[PDB]
Design an enzyme around this catalytic site. Structure first.
Site, short mmCIF file in Angstrom:
data_model
loop_
_atom_site.label_atom_id
_atom_site.label_comp_id
_atom_site.label_asym_id
_atom_site.label_seq_id
_atom_site.Cartn_x
_atom_site.Cartn_y
_atom_site.Cartn_z
N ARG A 258 0.87 -1.20 0.00
CA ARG A 258 0.00 0.00 0.00
C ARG A 258 0.90 1.24 0.00
O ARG A 258 1.78 1.37 0.83
CB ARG A 258 -0.92 -0.01 1.22
CG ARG A 258 -1.82 -1.24 1.25
CD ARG A 258 -2.99 -1.11 2.19
NE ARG A 258 -3.74 -2.36 2.17
CZ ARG A 258 -4.91 -2.53 2.76
NH1 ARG A 258 -5.51 -1.58 3.43
NH2 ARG A 258 -5.47 -3.71 2.66
N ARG A 266 1.51 0.90 10.62
CA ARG A 266 1.21 1.28 9.24
C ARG A 266 2.50 1.16 8.42
O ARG A 266 3.43 2.00 8.66
CB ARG A 266 0.65 2.70 9.13
CG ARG A 266 0.10 3.02 7.76
CD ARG A 266 -0.70 4.32 7.80
NE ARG A 266 -1.98 4.12 8.47
N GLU A 338 -8.01 -0.82 15.13
CA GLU A 338 -8.38 -1.73 14.03
C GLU A 338 -7.32 -2.80 13.78
O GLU A 338 -6.15 -2.47 13.52
CB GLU A 338 -8.59 -0.88 12.77
CG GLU A 338 -9.08 -1.66 11.58
CD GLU A 338 -9.06 -0.85 10.28
OE1 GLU A 338 -9.01 0.46 10.32
OE2 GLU A 338 -9.07 -1.50 9.20
N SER A 341 -11.06 -5.76 9.07
CA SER A 341 -12.37 -5.34 8.52
C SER A 341 -13.02 -6.58 7.91
O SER A 341 -12.38 -7.24 7.06
CB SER A 341 -12.26 -4.28 7.49
OG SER A 341 -11.92 -3.02 8.05
N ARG A 378 -0.12 -6.12 12.90
CA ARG A 378 -0.88 -5.55 14.02
C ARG A 378 -1.11 -6.59 15.11
O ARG A 378 -1.27 -6.22 16.25
CB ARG A 378 -2.17 -4.91 13.54
CG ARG A 378 -1.84 -3.61 12.80
CD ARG A 378 -3.06 -2.82 12.44
NE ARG A 378 -2.71 -1.70 11.60
CZ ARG A 378 -3.54 -0.75 11.23
NH1 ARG A 378 -4.76 -0.73 11.73
NH2 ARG A 378 -3.10 0.22 10.47
N1 LIG Z 1 -0.52 0.00 5.70
C1 LIG Z 1 -0.83 -0.92 6.61
N2 LIG Z 1 0.10 -1.47 7.39
C2 LIG Z 1 -0.20 -2.45 8.27
N3 LIG Z 1 -1.41 -3.00 8.43
C3 LIG Z 1 -2.40 -2.52 7.66
C4 LIG Z 1 -2.20 -1.42 6.73
N4 LIG Z 1 -3.36 -1.17 6.10
C5 LIG Z 1 -4.28 -2.08 6.58
N5 LIG Z 1 -3.71 -2.82 7.59
C6 LIG Z 1 -4.35 -3.90 8.38
O1 LIG Z 1 -4.99 -4.75 7.44
C7 LIG Z 1 -6.41 -4.91 7.78
C8 LIG Z 1 -7.17 -5.17 6.50
O2 LIG Z 1 -7.14 -4.01 5.61
S1 LIG Z 1 -8.53 -3.41 5.16
O3 LIG Z 1 -8.19 -2.48 4.11
O4 LIG Z 1 -9.15 -2.83 6.34
N6 LIG Z 1 -9.42 -4.59 4.65
C9 LIG Z 1 -9.04 -5.42 3.66
O5 LIG Z 1 -7.96 -5.30 3.00
C10 LIG Z 1 -9.97 -6.59 3.41
N7 LIG Z 1 -9.53 -7.36 2.21
C11 LIG Z 1 -10.11 -7.50 4.64
O6 LIG Z 1 -8.77 -7.98 4.99
C12 LIG Z 1 -6.70 -3.67 8.54
O7 LIG Z 1 -7.89 -3.81 9.31
C13 LIG Z 1 -5.45 -3.36 9.29
O8 LIG Z 1 -5.40 -4.16 10.48
#
Ligand SMILES: Nc1ncnc2c1ncn2[C@@H]1O[C@H](COS(=O)(=O)NC(=O)[C@@H](N)CO)[C@@H](O)[C@H]1O
Ligand SMILES: [Cl-]
Ligand SMILES: [K+]
Length: 413
Positions: A258, A266, A338, A341, A378
């Site tokens: 990401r 993050r 969080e 999701s 996390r």
């Molecule tokens: N940049 C990041 N770095 C670390 N953990 C992350 C980051 N972005 C998301 N997450 C973790 O990944 C989880 C899932 O990301 S989400 O966008 O919320 N949901 C999805 O991608 C869905 N496909 C369900 O997994 C989050 O709830 C968070 O715990």
């Protein structure tokens, strides 16, 4: 994407959906203007295409009856020119309608609460009691650097900011979590799959990441994108199929990328174990409650106190109809954060990726659902924080010890 006919017939159902998301209704106004021009050009062009077929035969009949056909041949040049003009307009309008339809978010479910942002997300349930510490807890980045199991300085040299290197017992903890998660989901009834993380444009469009969130993704040589979640490769496995043996439950580990908080909360690259379901439409609301339970079972087994929150319309994701977030306790912030999701997409992704099934009265779109079970980084944050000793060492959660050679405590090495 939504169903065009449904938006045309119910513009104020759809428009009020977009106001509940803090958007205007300009996209619907635009869509319905282009749609009306398409419909009127189709009527005019279908009439002229019929007339051209009749005039062609009229010319043949005039020639057999030895009559002059010049006035008809003249009329035909005008018919042919107006048809070409109408076909060019129809091509343009359909392209505009497709662009707009790919930009309109999903309709929130009837059980998604109305609110503007994360402050209006109701708490569904609170599970477990947060630890009462007798000393001042340290954050995960301080614990990880002192145990030498997380390296941020050397990650920055090889990559940049927002990365981490796991080392020794840190690498072994992350690996043990992934194995544990995949084993539990297998016992829950999910099929383990391991797909690539280089994704084409069609797959990224299928789950909703494209076109709207292109700037949040890493694009790569040869037209690929890096997956931001296993949701993308896994859901699109069944693109352009009729599905069998519904419901289908999958689970996968992938790395996640990401473009985008301290330490590993993050990062640009992180590991996640995902749950994906493909189900018949009338079952998807219950399948969401059951998928959520399957994700929170990981927290229960790790004895990490958490809560479940319902996302309001203003905080809901683009493609989702309904979401529950799992939020784990973080001692140094004295709040839940969080960690998952879990969402029902209704038939929004299924329409985009063309994922159907057969019924006795004809084909229908499946519903798709997904949820994190869990984001691994996390979960490592939650372990380092909630299982820390006064001396800075970390107790290993009981369920992970068999995956770690029977180790009970991470200490400096
Ligand atoms: N940049 C990041 N770095 C670390 N953990 C992350 C980051 N972005 C998301 N997450 C973790 O990944 C989880 C899932 O990301 S989400 O966008 O919320 N949901 C999805 O991608 C869905 N496909 C369900 O997994 C989050 O709830 C968070 O715990
Ligand atoms: Cl309104
Ligand atoms: K929004």
């Amino acid at each position: 994407m939504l169903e065009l006919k449904f938006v045309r017939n119910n513009p104020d159902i759809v428009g009020r959906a977009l106001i509940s998301r803090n958007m205007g209704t300009e996209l619907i106004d635009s869509l319905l203007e282009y749609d009306a021009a398409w419909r009127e050009c189709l009527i005019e062009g279908d009439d002229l295409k019929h007339k051209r077929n009749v005039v062609t035969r009229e010319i043949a009949q005039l020639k057999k009856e030895n009559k002059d056909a010049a006035s008809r041949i003249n009329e035909m040049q005008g018919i042919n020119s107006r048809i070409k003009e109408l076909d060019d307009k129809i091509r343009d309008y359909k392209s505009k309608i497709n662009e707009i339809m790919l930009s309109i978010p999903n309709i929130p479910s009837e059980t998604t609460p109305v609110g503007k942002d994360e402050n209006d997300n109701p708490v569904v349930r609170v599970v477990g009691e947060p630890r009462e510490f007798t000393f001042t807890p340290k954050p995960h980045w301080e614990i990880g650097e002192s145990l030498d199991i997380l390296d941020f300085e050397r990650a920055a040299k090889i990559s940049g900011q927002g990365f981490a290197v796991y080392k020794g017992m840190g690498a072994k903890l992350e690996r043990a979590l992934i194995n544990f998660m995949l084993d539990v989901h297998t016992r829950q009834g999910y099929l383990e799959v391991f797909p690539p993380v280089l994704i084409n444009e069609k797959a990224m469009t299928g789950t909703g990441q494209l076109p709207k969130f292109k700037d949040d993704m890493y694009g790569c040589t040869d037209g690929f994108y890096l997956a931001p979640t296993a949701e993308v490769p896994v859901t699109n496995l069944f693109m352009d199929e009729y599905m069998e043996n519904l419901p289908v439950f999958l689970t996968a580990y992938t790395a996640c990328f990401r473009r985008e908080t301290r330490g590993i909360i993050r990062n640009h690259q992180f590991n996640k174990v995902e749950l994906v379901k493909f189900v018949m439409p009338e079952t998807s609301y219950e399948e969401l409650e059951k998928l959520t339970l399957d994700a929170e079972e990981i927290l229960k087994l790790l004895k990490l106190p958490y809560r479940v929150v319902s996302l309001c319309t203003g905080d809901l994701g683009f493609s989702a109809a309904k979401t529950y977030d799992l939020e784990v306790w973080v001692p140094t912030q004295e709040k839940y954060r969080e960690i998952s999701s879990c969402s029902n997409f209704d038939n929004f992704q299924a329409r985009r990726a063309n994922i159907r099934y057969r019924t006795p009265e004809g084909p229908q779109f499946v519903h798709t659902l997904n949820g994190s079970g869990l984001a691994v980084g996390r979960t490592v944050v939650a372990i380092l924080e909630n299982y820390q000793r006064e001396d800075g060492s970390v107790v290993i959660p009981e369920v992970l010890r068999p995956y770690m050679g029977g180790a009970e405590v991470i200490r400096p090495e």
